[PDB]
Design a protein around this ligand. Structure first.
Ligand SMILES: Cc1ncc(-c2ccnc(Nc3ccc(S(C)(=O)=O)cc3)n2)n1C(C)C
Lengths: 71, 284
């Protein structure tokens, strides 16, 4: 199963990481960040406008997400 | 060896199974660590039995004395003084509402630093320090177990790990053990882990959220490290005392000095023993 972390926040962004099972992790690009279309094909389900902003290389199964706070 | 008798299993360590046993001659109760030795290439001598014999010669009241070392049938047996409780277990025996006695926290931290200074002075690291590796007798003495075993072999774990290691620094040294003693100091006081992360990346973010996201201003050359990113969340430094309770101003000062980002600027074991926190230290 796919696990969704609680939200945490900055002064500018709100954040949330998502842990995929390790057999799906071989399907996550080791070279570029992902479009909202791309990460939905892996079965990640959440609201619009979350952006895949970085890769921690030791844990390719962990998708890190970020969305700007409104002003 | 035929000199000892297994009583019962006590647990699994990383390196092998651990039993409680008795010496047939003395009647002394012991811990026995069985290790199955890996097959080795001919024309490549093993450091492992050599390095383990060196550790037998380390004596200090606050480390777990390696009393002997046996070899029967390609299996290595390590024999230690038996202690029946560890710090993880001690903290669990304290009920909700109660906290560890203010003076016993001080005593334990003093003992832990004494043991780590002894190892560090003899050029030996733990590297893997955590409540399960801190054993206690009924008389209120505390000792490091598994010192130097990591180097001898390898080529809940995450909470006590230092930011050097997490960010992928090429090299590391004695300060890694000081960071760990830091996070354990806080746990003795509060009963709960200071940095309770679910992954390497979450562990960093919890460290950042309490001590500030590091940059080159507070930690020289950090922005060059293998797993640094300019995109990390950006929390400001300050508000360590909001994450911890039951510590006077000296305690908080020592703690903050054990948790400095730069390994070079971080407090040493020697210096920590002279800190004001220990001035009013107590019987046992
Ligand atoms: C990895 C290792 N190598 C040698 C030991 C070791 C050395 C001396 N005494 C003990 N005794 C002990 C520890 C923990 C517990 S418990 C069930 O309360 O967790 C019960 C008895 N153990 N150890 C320990 C750290 C397992």
């Amino acid at each position: 199963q796919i696990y969704y972390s609680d939200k945490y926040f900055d002064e500018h962004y709100e954040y949330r990481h998502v842990m995929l099972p390790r057999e799906l992790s071989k399907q996550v690009p080791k070279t570029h960040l992902m479009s909202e279309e791309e990460w939905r094909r892996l079965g990640v389900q959440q609201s619009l406008g979350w952006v895949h902003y970085m890769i921690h290389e030791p844990e390719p199964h962990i998708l890190l997400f970020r969305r700007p706070l409104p002003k | 060896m035929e000199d000892y008798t297994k009583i019962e299993k006590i647990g699994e360590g990383t390196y092998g199974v651990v039993y409680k046993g008795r010496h047939k001659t003395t009647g002394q109760v012991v811990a026995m660590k069985k290790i199955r030795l890996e097959s080795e290439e001919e024309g490549v001598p093993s450091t492992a039995i050599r390095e383990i014999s060196l550790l037998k010669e380390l004596r200090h009241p606050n480390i777990v004395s390696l009393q002997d070392v046996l070899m029967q049938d390609s299996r290595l047996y390590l024999i230690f003084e038996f202690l029946s409780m560890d710090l993880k277990k001690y903290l669990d025996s304290i009920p909700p509402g109660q906290y560890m006695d203010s003076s016993l926290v001080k005593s334990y931290l003093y003992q832990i630093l004494q043991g780590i200074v002894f190892c560090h002075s003899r050029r030996v690291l733990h590297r893997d320090l955590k409540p399960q590796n801190l054993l206690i007798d009924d008389k209120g003495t505390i000792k490091l177990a598994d010192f130097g075993l990591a180097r001898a072999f390898g080529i809940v774990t995450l909470w006590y790990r230092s930011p050097e290691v997490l960010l992928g620094s090429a090299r590391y040294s004695t300060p890694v053990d000081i960071w760990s003693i830091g996070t354990i100091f806080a746990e003795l006081a509060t009963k709960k882990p200071l940095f309770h992360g679910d992954s390497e990346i979450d562990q960093l973010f919890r460290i950042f959220r309490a001590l500030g996201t590091p940059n080159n201003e507070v930690w020289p050359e950090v922005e060059s490290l293998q797993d640094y990113k300019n995109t990390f969340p950006k929390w400001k430094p300050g508000s360590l005392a909001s994450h911890v309770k039951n510590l006077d101003e000296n305690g908080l000062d020592l703690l903050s000095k054990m948790l400095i980002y730069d390994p070079a600027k971080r407090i040493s074991g020697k210096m920590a023993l002279n800190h004001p926190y220990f001035n009013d230290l107590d019987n046992q």
